[PDB]
Every structure is written in C-alpha cells, then in structure tokens.
Symmetry: C3
Subunit: 218 residues, 3 copies
C-alpha cells in the first residue's frame, strides 16, 4: 500500500542521487576540456596573427625584389646591346687600321725607292757636270777664236789673204813669177837665170864675163 509507494520512491531517489553524481562528474570533465580548448584557441589566434604579419612582410620583400630584378634585367639587355655594337665597332676599326697599315707599308717602299733613285740622279748630274766642265774648259783654253793678218776668220772658217807675188799652187803657198824675166822656181827654190857665156856670179853679184868682148877686142 503506502509502504510499497514509499519503498518505490526510496528506490528511485537512490537512482536519482547516483545519476546526479555521475552527471556532475561528467559536467566537471566537460568544463575542464572547454577551458583547455579556450586556451588552445588563444594560442592559435596569437600564432596565426603572427603568421599573417610575417606573410605580409614576405609579400612586401618579394614585390620589392621583383622590381629591382626587373630593372637589372633591362640594364643587362641594354649592356648586351652596347657590348654587341662595341664588338662590331672594334672589328671595323681593326679592318680599317690594317688597310691603312698596308698603305703605309706601300708608301715606305715608295719613299725608299725615290730616295735611291734621286741619289743615283744627283750622282749622275755631278758626273756629267764634271766631265763637261773639263771638256768645255779644255776647248775654251785651246780653241782658235781670233787671228792676225794675213789670217782672217768668218763663220768658223779661216782664210789667208795674199797679195800679187804669192799664190796657190796645188794645195800650197807658192811664189808667182809671171812671164819670163829671168826668175824661176828650180833646185829647191827661187833662182835668177842668166846666159853663162855672158854673165857669171862673183860674191853673189851679177858680173859680166871676162871673155864677153873677146870677139870685139880681136
């Protein structure tokens, strides 16, 4: 009856008491685990906040590096064009210098050639001047350029003027003896001629012979 209803309550009350104590232990365990979770949350928020700032710094550093590198790339491209032209320019100036060196090599050979050719010609002029000076001089000292009477010169020709009594016989000067007056060229020269029965020569004087008048005296 009423004792049965009380006994049933006491039975349930003991179960309620045991279950309440178990729920309390479980709720205490859940609370501790929540605190540990809130601590982990705070640690994670701080680590993530630090990681986010570090990432932002890395993005600034990388972005600044990319621009510096981009600049370096253009400068290297400009220097590559400048070295390329410098190698072309130096190759051209070397070809131009070598072509000029060949021209100087030819000019040095032509200068040396003119030096000996002029030396030969200067020596030749000295040789001709000396030989001709000596030859002209010999002629000037020894050639006949004037003459005294009976000789005369007209246009490089010398002639001899002769008066009557002197003439040319063959190629020679001779004594002219016209007619017959007792003069003759004989016995190597000029001789006088006389009748040898009438005349004689005594002391180189014409003399009448001693016997001339013998026929008259007889």
């Amino acid at each position: 009856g009423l004792e049965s209803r009380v006994s049933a309550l006491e039975k349930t009350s003991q179960i309620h008491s045991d279950t309440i104590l178990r729920i309390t232990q479980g709720l205490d365990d859940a609370n501790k685990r929540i605190i540990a979770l809130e601590q982990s949350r705070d640690d994670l928020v701080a680590s993530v906040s630090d990681a986010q700032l570090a990432i932002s710094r890395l993005e600034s550093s990388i972005g600044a590096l990319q621009t510096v590198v981009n600049g370096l790339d253009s400068s290297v491209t400009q220097l590559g064009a400048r070295v390329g032209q410098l190698e072309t320019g130096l190759a051209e100036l070397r070809v131009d210098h070598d072509n000029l060196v060949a021209r100087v090599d030819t000019a040095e050979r032509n200068i040396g050639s003119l030096t000996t050719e002029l030396s030969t010609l200067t020596l030749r002029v000295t040789s001709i001047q000396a030989d001709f000076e000596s030859r002209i001089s010999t002629l000037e000292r020894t050639a006949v350029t004037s003459a005294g009477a009976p000789l005369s010169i007209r246009n490089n020709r010398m002639t001899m003027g002769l008066n009557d009594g002197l003439t040319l016989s063959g190629n020679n000067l001779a004594i002219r003896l016209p007619g017959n007056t007792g003069l003759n060229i004989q016995n190597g020269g000029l001789q006088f001629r006389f009748n040898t029965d009438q005349f004689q020569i005594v002391n180189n004087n014409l003399t009448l012979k001693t016997t001339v008048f013998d026929s008259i005296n007889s």
Copy 2:
C-alpha cells in the same frame, strides 16, 4: 496526510526522472561537440606548425636571394662604368685613326707628285746630256787646237811668223822688195826689170841684146 505528501513526492520524482534524462541527453551532446573541437584543434595546431616552418624557410630564401641580387646590382653598375669607358675609348680611337688617314691621304698625293717631278727631271738630264755630248764631241773633232810653224796659237789667237822678205800689204801676205834692185811686183806677180835696149830674155835667161854694136 501522508497520501498527499507521498503523492507530491511521486509527482516531483517523475519530473526529476524526465529532467535527468534530458540533462543526460544534453551532456552527451556537449561531449560529442567537445570531441569534434579537440580534433579540429589538433588539426589546426599541425597546420599552424607547418605554416610557421614554411614561413621560416621563405624568410631564409628571400634573405639569401636579396644578398645575391645586391651582388648582381653592384656587378651591373661596375660593367656599366667599363662599357661607357670602352665606348669613349673606341670613339676617341676612330677620330685619331680618321685624322691619321688624312695624313696618309696627303702623303700618297705628295709621293705621286715627287715620282712625277723626278721622272720628268730624269728625262730632262738625259735630254741635256745627249745634246751636249754630241755638241762637245763635234767641237772636239773639228776645232783647231794646235798649229805647225809658221802658225802659232797664244790666248786663242792664231798668228803667222814672218822672216825678212815677207811682210803685210794691208792685211795680205806680200813679198818685201826693199829699195830698187830691179825686182818689182807687176803683171800679176814677181818680175825682174832690165833696160830693153841692152838686155833680152832667151829661155828665161838674162841675155845681152844682140843689137849692141
């Protein structure tokens, strides 16, 4: 009395059972949600640790790359100075070459004139030598340089030496006949003169005239 007290206890006891069951249900659900949070927490810790390590590596590699980019920047600057010096040096040498070319241009033009003027002078010396050689030798072959007696040369003048018997009549050679000895220049030359009543000529001999009785 007790029936009402027990009845009240029974009513509260039934409410307690129902609330206890709902609380157990709630605690069970809270426990399941705590487990999921602990697992999520473990996964976050692992991923944050991995993120920190990766950041640390990015910091190291950016730093090393900055050092290399700094070294590259200085090299590009040093090369830029060297290139500009080479560009000036080549432009200076091209000017110095072009000026020396102009000096060779005149030298080549001066050699060409010297070669021409020497060639004309050589032909002139040959021309002068041949003309004078012929003229001198003609004079050396034909000119009178000596003479035999009665001719003599003194200071380029030729004279004729004359003995008594030969003289000048004007500028002509003549026979000298001093005084009157019967010799005379007449009838075109030398003749002997005699009295024509006392002498005659027979075979070019002076003869006494026959009519002298």
Copy 3:
C-alpha cells in the same frame, strides 16, 4: 517510522531539485562556450587556409625569381668576359695605332726632305744647262773648224803647205834662195845683187854702166 521515511525523502527531493537547477545552469554555460569555440574554430580554419594559400603563392614567386636571378647571373658573367676581351682588344689597337703614327711621323719628314733635295737638284740642273748652253754656243760660233788652202786641218791641227821657194827660218815663213844666183835676203828683204862697176839701177831697171864700153 513511515513518516520518518517520508521526511527523509522530502529532504532528498529538495536537494535533487536544487542540484538539477545548478546542473542546468552549468550545462547552459557549457553550451554557450561550445558555440563560441565552434565559431572561433571556423574562423581559424578560414584564416589558416588563407595563410596556406598565401604561403604556396610566395613559394612559386621565390622559385620563379631564383630562376630569373640565376639566368641574369649567367648573363652578367658572359658580359663581363666579353667586356674584358674588348678592353684587351682596344688596348691592342691603341698600341698598333700609336706605332703607325710614329711611322707616318718619320715618313712625312722623309717626304719633306725629298721635296727639298729634288727642288735643289732641279735648280742646279737648270743652272748647269744655262751655263753650258752659253759656253758651248759661244765655242760653236767662234771656234775655227775649217780652213782654205794653203791652210789645212788634220786631227785639230792646222798646218800650212809650202812650195819650193817658201820655207822656215826658225818659226818664221822665209823665202828660199838656193845657191848663189844674185838673189839675197838683205836690207830687210829680197834684193838683186850686181857688180856696181858694170851695172846700175835706173827707174828700177838693170842697166849697163857707160864705162863698160870705154
């Protein structure tokens, strides 16, 4: 007895009601804190995921930049080698040009000395030509190169041909009178001689003296 048991149950029933309410308050506190942790967890997942995505992007950028930088380093090295070859080349051309400048410096001095020597010789040749021309043509105009008889030239020597009657007394032209014929060179020239007791000269005529007949 039974009333003592009822009173024991009532006391326990009130303790149960009070603890149930405290557990209800505790469980409610737990649920609020769980909801907040779940939302914080969702935000952390989103923020960690954003950070992981940002990290992988930086890793790609660093990898790509390192590639470019190594290429640039390779490019600067080759350039530095070309620059060094250009420097040794320009220094070689400068030496070669300055050695040619010295060769042109001596060649110009040689050309100048050769212009002087050729100019001096040209004037000298003209002087020799003018002096010799005058002297030669003076000899050509005045020198004796031919002679009329009795003068004759043989090998630049002039002689005079003489017939009998003409000879030489030393270097002088003389009349030759062989033997004793009455002719003699006396009183400055040619005279005829005669016996002055038998002959006389009257009007330059040989005459017999009157005394010869007596």
